[model samples]
Target: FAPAADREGYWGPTTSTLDWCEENYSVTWYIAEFWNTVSNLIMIIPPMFGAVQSVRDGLEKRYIASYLALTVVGMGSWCFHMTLKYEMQLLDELPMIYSCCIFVYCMFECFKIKNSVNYHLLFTLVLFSLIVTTVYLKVKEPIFHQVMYGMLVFTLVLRSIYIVTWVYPWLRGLGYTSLGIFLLGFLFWNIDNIFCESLRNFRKKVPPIIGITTQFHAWWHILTGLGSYLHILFSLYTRTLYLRADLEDNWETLNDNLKVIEKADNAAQVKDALTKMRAAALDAQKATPPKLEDKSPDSPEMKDFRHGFDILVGQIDDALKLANEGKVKEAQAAAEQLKTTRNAYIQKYL
Candidate 1:
């Protein structure tokens, strides 16, 4: 059920109201709870890479906030368990609330107008965290913090559910694992609390390494840290995918309309479809979304495609001119020339 219990060594006394099952000062003179404190590396290390990668890839700053906040939560948790002090506990717990707010912001705002701030949502979250911090400071109740954390996670869970259910059915795999692992970590957290006494007794009868396996609170930190990391990744992936989908859809619509123009029965129909095609072609040209890598619209393949399409648009204009002047045979030949240009580009690019 527990690590061991508080022992006098380096940190004076446990001033933190809530203590985990890890026995204080058992492993080293300085670190109060060995396994609990060290296990927070799961929270610390990976998020550093996550943040660095986010910056390197030029992701939105909010996601960087999420990653850095996670690292802070890990560092704070490390200090809390190592020192078992009241201030350190606050350091550990408050960031959990802060980081989750960042997560909520990322997920809900993923589909909104790109790079635009949602001031209303931002204000609400900042206000909510401020209220929670003030009340929890006065109350000094651990349960209050825990409950608030659960509520934020609940909000994320609901958003994930809606996204996977309706918008991205394929993303359910990544999405559900994030949810499931978080819940699994929470399950171990409850078990550590309820069975602390029995676990403590059981540890004495087992070998040291074997006894360490019963450190469920440490497991909670590891599992939850991983799940949270995955959640951020899932959110980032969803946003990138949403952007990419719009980019390709623009091209798809343009191509579909081009086919309609190719099958036109008369000059009027050809002109009509060409008008719509010109708009769609311009839309496609400007739909250059940022990619995860270096896949810009100015890449060689896209440049070639753009050049080819421009030539076809110009040739179609020539065909229209011929048809307008009543040169039936010449208009037909001009239209026929478009097929070769279109087919060459279509086979090469589209």
Candidate 2:
């Protein structure tokens, strides 16, 4: 706002070109558009919170990646709003574009409750972003800018809605809250744009008499920041199925000690849970997950692993029966079957 887009290739004589809205550079650099820039503080804090919490809990790698992506979005928005210049423009919005790709990948992992990072997904996203970014740099058209950002946002909103429909138990409230805030932020952004005059006039009804300084756009930053953090928490929450599978994967390793169950305050409940877990494991062994005909997902295999799973399950079943029959030593020896094969399967699938 300070220099007033005085550059040759600035905001331009292209008002009617794209998502048309009157350019209101009212505050200028003396005030430095403080509210807009300060609003980004809301954006910055979530990634910090996410990083601190994830580290304290020792979360998985994918969680770290997601948080980092959130950080990029925050930083990008910060650089964008602070300068409000053509040079700083892509710096701001591009991370937002990149983050959508991350969100889609995380959604796949959450829905499937899959373990292991999909490196291939990252490559695809990188390649796509490079293509888009290169093209946009050459053609800095406002229509293109609006379309790129708009389409991605539309898809992200749909994905958010899709996640909300799932029964995530305790996490559903968080998911709904995140979705609501994001939509609200989206509304504010539009209001700041298309309804700028109407809102400025309305603000006169009751305000601090601080000139025409009603920054609904700043509210977009705040709500969106909160929403982003909530969304990350929801991602972690949806990862439960995979976490439980990991627990079951290593359960046989605790065969003889029985110390884990004994240590549990809810021993009966723990045992019951263990029993149900093994039952499912047994079923999974019998009905092997079908990989592609030389196509699909996983850590691949050291051998024809489906057959190996069957053998391990049978061996594991023997241990269970031995334990049930009070043959403690024999059961521990039998449980050794899980140490190699089961761990191997988990390592691959994850």
Candidate 3:
């Protein structure tokens, strides 16, 4: 069952003795195998139960009917594998089949539950399951387990691509909460594997005399579990940052465009630009901030206006500073800030 095996003549004395014991203690061997089988069944059952719950919920919600049906089919296949005395060839192929089914269900769930707490939780659970399975396979050293591992890795990459392509752009356009969800999801997914792999490597090198190998793996698993949760948290933070940047950009753009409007000699052009400026400013006001009462200003709309005013003040200050330093061109540039801000402000009023 373990890796690092050789031919019969190469078997260690310890393994040879164990084999002898197993032959003589046939009843003990049977009991051990029976319990092992039962344990695996127990482990696999809850996810199946959860799958049923998910399918029922999806049906009620009226989404992804085909995907949910596939999930049910996958669950049934798992049950069949457990019950039937299938040929070794078929049995060997079950994990890959089951993984593909689970991955599809996971992707469907991602779409079905987009922006929901349940979706985040479900994604985290699926990632955790993959990490566990990867570790298990690494330890087991089965003949064909690499194929299963590769499939699982492919599933993860596919999910990541889905999020980046479809989900990220949508959330970005929607502004606040959506952006938060996207970033949190991104950060968590990336960080978990990073730290998990680090821990695994660390444990592999740690001395066995201190019993560090198992402990290290245990801690690594814990880190990954926590990383799953943190992914949600960081997504929220990143969203907040995105909103702030967006608002700041809008405010600055409006302030700049207002200047161009005022400079337009044509009344029609000025009116059109003025209309766009107002709309942009209104959007800036409505945009969410990290805090309602930020230090920048209380009313973001007014603050943006005040910011336009402050630009004029800053120009004067810059001009004085440049003049004191005997830099004429720099001082001219500084004076331009005052003219620019005044022109922009007048356009809004006019």
Top candidate by TM-score: 1
Indicate the TM-score of model 1.
Answer: 0.71
Model 3 gets an lDDT of 0.41
Candidate 2 local lDDT, residue 225: 83
The residue-by-residue lDDT of candidate 2 on 1-350, one tens digit each, is 26544222334332222221223333343323445666777667768777778888888767777787778777766655554555556766677777767776776666553455677877887887787788887877765765876776666666656666755455567777888898888888888777745435334553363533456777788898888778777777777554554334443443323333334443343444336546655545433243423543343452345555566666656666765676655555533455576565643542
Candidate 3 structure quality by residue, lDDT tens digits, 60-145: 32223323333343333333323322332234333444444444454445433334545565576467556656664456443345
Which runs of model 3 end up more than 4 angstroms from their true locations?
1-35, 59-89, 101-145, 161-350
Q: Is candidate 1 or candidate 2 better by TM-score?
A: 1
- Clash count in backbone of candidate 3: 1
Q: What lDDT would each prediction earn against the true structure?
A: 0.81, 0.60, 0.41
By summed lDDT, the worst window of 10 consecutive residues in model 1 runs over: 284-293
Work out how many backbone clashes candidate 2 has: 2
